[PDB]
Design a protein around this nucleic acid. Structure first.
Ligand code: SF4
Ligand SMILES: [Mn+2]
Ligand SMILES: [Mn+2]
Ligand SMILES: [Mn+2]
Ligand SMILES: [Mn+2]
Lengths: 554, 95, 340, 91
DNA sequence: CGTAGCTGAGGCCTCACGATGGACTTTTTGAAT
DNA sequence: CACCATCGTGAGGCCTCAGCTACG
């Protein structure tokens, strides 16, 4: 039946390279670029993207020089788009272009491309042609390397067709390669997560250092309430009061955040859409109103697993326990390492640490989500009660925290407003990161969905509140980013001047691009990369691939 | 790891010049009367050299691309006599 | 119902918020109003303008602003971060695991598709001169197959029966051409739907089907639905399994009808095709002439979803999608499909 | 050990331009419409920067001096799209 | 004497200020050792 | 803040060369 479409022969090329790679690229979309995929597209585009002669149906005697020829056979089960076909009359031969030098292997062609060429050869044989050969035309040195369709080469090809069919119908993603040298360049290593999944799935190794991210930029923040962001070709000029304040290069921009009444010309919006650069609209105070989407994310297994597990109580319960236990542990660690007292107060009171650890453990043994929410509330209450203990060595002028003023709409403290802004501006980061990995940021296991606060970003940000939001607030107050003059009163409460908002946002950005070391894998990773890695690991955990989600307790 | 590239051109047709000024503002920031400084990683340098092999006419134009260094240590490598020289910084745009 | 989508055709337009109203202006001069009570997605065409205050008022009321190009090419949505639609998505995902949900909606979709096919037979039969009517034996046969689809036991039986009935419809599809066999435009009854188009008529059919699938994808995503999680088709490999599920009733009305329009109006001729060793593909001029034709068919007005108010097809799609989400979560039983 | 320097200028006064074209032919070889490539050791780079701090007017001119490398390994560092690029050879 | 020096005529390089316009196209391919 | 951002024609400013005058 329609249990499986025709296998594209490039996925046949990928399967003999890394079966997990074929599964990712074919059964879940999930493609990403690097140096080499971009370079290969650049090679192929200028010549073989454009068509050429047709493969004559009636062939008697004339040169066949067809280009970008699309065949398929459904007896075989494959579909192809041959780069070129060179044939004299009735003896044709596929020609596949590559990008690099001739490889340093016997026969000059690795196992995968040989299989791809043999598959295209079988397809040509299907449509009434005599191929018995092929070639690999490396564009860089145009050193055509012939390939002969040896018999067990065809054996390999048909075996690979059957193997891919079975592994797709099974529905279980094959394990990663074992510490291979293929993986550090497979352009999905940021999605395969080979070493991480190996290590957590108890095929235990020591995770090799992060194959670093490549080709991603930094956000665009538009905080001015009277800015006008318009397109200027590939740049993106932000003019305020008819004068160019700044330009942003679209190739180097990764998000857009529009605070308050900042206008974005429809053309700029279209250009952002053409690149899937997320655009997020926020209130003046950081409330996350809406964002931009485009016909969903082609990965379905991720969302299907997410929802199906969301309908399971103890999965939700285990995840929520992990999350708020991580939150309480991080609160304890922050309270310790940044407590600033003078004498007999300069180091943390162990009674508080006793209470916090006992609450950690009371949550770890929670019976249901109700008691879990109760314990989270109590622990956060104690933590904030002691929060003021540790900024600027004590409260400054006006920089007064009220522990009872938390968790409600209009902030009537300076530092309350600062915390609420940081929270509401980390929720955006988490939402973007979660939507970029195929998940649905609004279906959460612990929190309930309500306007402006997606239920899953609110969940997976719980461990990261003390590390990012509270840490940014503390560093901003201590270093003198914000003093009392920066705030302005209002009937609602407290707000920040523009000079304050720009400095605070810059501080938050510096925090997000600030490297740490993962407790579990032990490599230096920026916080922004860490959010993506954690989202991907959640997808894997829901997939049943790994036993449990790594909560990043520090 | 990103590198700092300096790109300088001579273009002998005003249409091609518009096309190239187009593309170059796509990639780096203006430095001198026909020079751009670009801070690019590998994917983007591949993109830039792909663009400027079809913008220009190889018969009579001339585009020069200089790879100064790892973009963290470029300041000892560049000495400017008139205006100040300040390399492209990788940070978000907050305004 | 509650309200209807607002389509801002004018690329000149500038849209503001007037309290409880959404005001369209042209050159500082008014055009029309929406007033947010009976509104649905606000569709903005190329270089229209939507004031950020109006955008915020749309988001607070959780209205899916959608951005189309000047021609009408879809470019993206703009959804709000509220539970308006996640309820719809969670209902879809929770209910897609059910056997009657999948089976029942599949039976309805197939019976509607068959009914549209036979109605298009009785509409556009052009065996003119001697056979002004289709063979009523064929019509009785398709009626019988429609009952069978009403009482199919399970999904695979329905798939087999669907394939059968669609094949016997395509047997007389070529009977619907400019009056006879379209020599120079040959139609193959059996080589249907293979990935490369081996016939010019099949090339037109596949291209129309693809465009209809895209329209259905964007319409489904406009409402809070995941187009990639289907009830009848199969989900993975990147196939939109809900667009493919719901476009089935609309295949005769928008795809077959568009091909018939463009082939009986002489828009598509044998010179427009290129044939290569088993592939018949359109030429660029012909491709975009056919795109214009697909637009023209998508611009027609039909009156009767269940409420008679002469919507364009591109808005009937949203009406159907909203009806689907409204069937889910238990408002209206059994999803009142659109059949002519 | 010698280094390869690339020097590019914008000069807003024709007399100063003559003075600088003077000096630059003194030091390196023409490369582009306002660019010279110079292969200099330390003494000569000191001389060049001494000359171009008095040829030019610091208020409105702009001279840029780029130190590509050790002049033996410059070829991987320079990619030319139009004409060929060939570094200065010491012979 | 010869080479330093100043004038023109043309060729590059960019900007403020105007008028046209109204791109978007099936599915495949695309690296790495 | 009225469709908005790619196209492109003028006026000025850089950049160089050929051809001159003095000259020592
Ligand atoms: S590391 Fe990359 S190439 Fe290797 S198996 Fe994993 S996804 Fe495939
Ligand atoms: Mn909470
Ligand atoms: Mn130049
Ligand atoms: Mn069907
Ligand atoms: Mn210059």
């Amino acid at each position: 039946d329609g249990s499986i479409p025709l296998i594209p022969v490039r996925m046949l090329n990928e399967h003999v390279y890394c079966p997990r790679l074929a599964y990712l690229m074919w059964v879940q979309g999930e493609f990403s670029h690097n140096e080499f995929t971009v370079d290969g597209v650049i090679r192929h585009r200028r010549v073989d993207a454009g068509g050429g002669v047709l493969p004559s149906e009636t062939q008697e005697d004339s040169r066949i020089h067809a280009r970008s020829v699309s065949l398929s056979s459904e007896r075989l089960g494959i579909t192809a788009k041959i780069d070129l076909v060179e044939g004299e009359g009735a003896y044709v031969s596929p020609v596949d272009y590559k990008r690099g030098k001739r490889p340093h292997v016997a026969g000059g062609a690795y196992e995968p491309e040989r299989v791809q060429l043999c598959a295209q050869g079988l397809l040509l044989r299907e449509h009434g042609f005599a191929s018995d050969g092929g070639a690999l035309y490396f564009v860089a040195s145009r050193e055509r390397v012939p390939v002969a369709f040896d018999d067990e080469l065809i054996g390999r090809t048909l075996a690979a067709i059957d193997e891919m069919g079975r592994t797709a119908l099974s529905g279980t993603m094959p394990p990663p390669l074992e510490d291979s040298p293929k993986c550090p360049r497979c352009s999905l290593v940021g999605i395969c997560l080979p070493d991480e999944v190996r290590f957590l799935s108890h095929l235990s190794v020591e995770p090799r250092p992060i194959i670093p991210a490549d080709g991603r930029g930094l956000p665009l923040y538009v905080q001015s309430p009277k800015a006008y962001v318009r397109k200027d070709g590939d740049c993106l000029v932000i003019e305020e009061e008819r004068v160019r304040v700044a330009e942003a290069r679209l190739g180097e921009t990764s998000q857009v955040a529009l605070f308050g009444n900042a206008t974005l010309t429809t053309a700029a919006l279209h250009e952002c859409l053409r690149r899937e650069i997320p655009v997020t609209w926020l209130s003046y105070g950081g409330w996350f109103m809406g964002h931009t989407v485009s016909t969903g994310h082609r990965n379905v297994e991720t969302r299907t697993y997410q929802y199906q597990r969301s309908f399971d109580p103890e999965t939700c319960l285990n995840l929520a326990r992990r999350w708020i236990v991580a939150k309480i542990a991080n609160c304890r660690t922050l309270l310790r390492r940044n407590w600033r007292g003078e004498g007999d107060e300069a180091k943390a009171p162990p009674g508080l640490l006793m209470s916090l650890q006992d609450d950690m453990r009371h949550a770890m043994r929670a019976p249901s989500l109700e008691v879990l929410l109760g314990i989270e509330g109590a622990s956060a209450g104690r933590y904030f009660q002691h929060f003021s203990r540790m900024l600027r060595g004590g409260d400054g002028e006006g920089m007064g925290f009220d522990f009872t003023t938390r968790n409600r709409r209009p902030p009537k403290d300076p530092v309350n407003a600062l915390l609420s802004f940081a929270y509401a501006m980390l929720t955006r980061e988490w939402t973007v990161a979660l939507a970029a990995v195929g998940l649905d940021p609004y279906r959460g296991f612990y929190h309930q969905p309500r306007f402006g606060r997606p239920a899953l970003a609110l969940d997976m940000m719980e461990p990261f509140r003390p590390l990012i939001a509270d840490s940014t607030v503390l560093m901003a107050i201590n270093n003198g980013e914000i003093r009392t003059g920066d705030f302005v009163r209002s009937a609602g409460g407290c707000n920040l001047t523009d000079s304050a908002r720009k400095r605070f946002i810059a501080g938050f950005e510096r925090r997000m691009e600030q490297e740490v070391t993962h407790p579990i894998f032990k490599y230096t990773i920026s916080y922004r990369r860490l959010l993506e890695v954690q989202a991907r690991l959640l997808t894997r955990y829901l997939s049943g691939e790994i036993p449990a989600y790594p909560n990043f307790v520090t | 790891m990103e590198h700092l590239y300096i790109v300088s051109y001579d273009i002998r047709n005003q249409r091609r010049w518009r096309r190239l000024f187009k593309t170059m503002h796509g990639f780096g920031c203006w430095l001198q009367l026909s020079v751009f400084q670009c801070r690019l990683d590998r994917i983007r340098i591949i993109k830039m050299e792909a663009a400027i092999n079809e913008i220009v006419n190889h018969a009579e134009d001339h585009v020069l691309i200089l790879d100064l260094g790892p973009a963290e240590n470029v300041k000892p490598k560049v000495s400017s006599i008139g205006k100040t020289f300040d390399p492209i910084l990788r940070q978000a745009v907050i305004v | 119902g509650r309200g209807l989508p607002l389509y801002v055709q004018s690329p000149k337009a500038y849209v503001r918020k007037d309290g409880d109203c959404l005001v369209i202006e042209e050159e500082r001069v008014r055009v029309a109003e929406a007033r947010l009570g009976e509104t649905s997605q606000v569709a903005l065409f190329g270089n229209a303008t939507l004031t950020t205050a109006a955008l915020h008022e749309c988001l607070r009321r959780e209205i899916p602003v959608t951005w189309l190009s000047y021609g009408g090419w879809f470019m993206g949505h703009t959804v709000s971060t509220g539970h308006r639609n996640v309820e719809t998505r969670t209902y879809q995902y929770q209910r897609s695991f059910d056997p009657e949900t999948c089976l029942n909606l599949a039976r309805r979709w197939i019976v509607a598709k068959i009914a549209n096919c036979r109605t298009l037979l009785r509409r556009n039969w052009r065996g003119e001169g001697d056979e002004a009517k289709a063979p009523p034996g064929l019509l009785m046969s398709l009626q019988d197959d429609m009952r069978h689809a009403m009482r199919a036991p399970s999904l695979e039986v329905l798939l087999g029966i669907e394939g059968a009935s669609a094949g016997r419809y395509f047997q007389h599809f070529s009977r619907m051409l400019r009056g006879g066999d379209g020599e120079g435009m040959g139609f193959d009854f059996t080589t249907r739907n293979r990935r490369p188009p081996k016939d010019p008529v099949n090339a037109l059919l596949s291209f129309a089907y693809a465009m209809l699938t895209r329209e259905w994808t964007v319409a489904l995503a406009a409402v809070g639905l995941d187009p990639y999680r289907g009830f009848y088709h199969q989900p993975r490999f990147g196939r939109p399994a809900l667009a493919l599920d719901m476009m089935e009733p609309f295949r005769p009305l928008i795809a077959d009808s568009t091909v018939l329009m463009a082939i009986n109006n002489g828009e598509i001729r044998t010179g427009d095709f290129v044939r290569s060793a088993g592939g018949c593909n359109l030429t660029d001029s012909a491709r975009k002439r056919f795109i214009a034709g697909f637009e023209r068919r998508m611009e027609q007005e039909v009156t009767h979803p269940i409420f008679k108010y002469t919507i364009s097809y591109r808005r009937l799609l949203e009406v159907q999608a909203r009806l689907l989400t409204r069937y889910l979560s238990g408002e209206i039983p059994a999803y009142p499909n659109f059949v002519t």
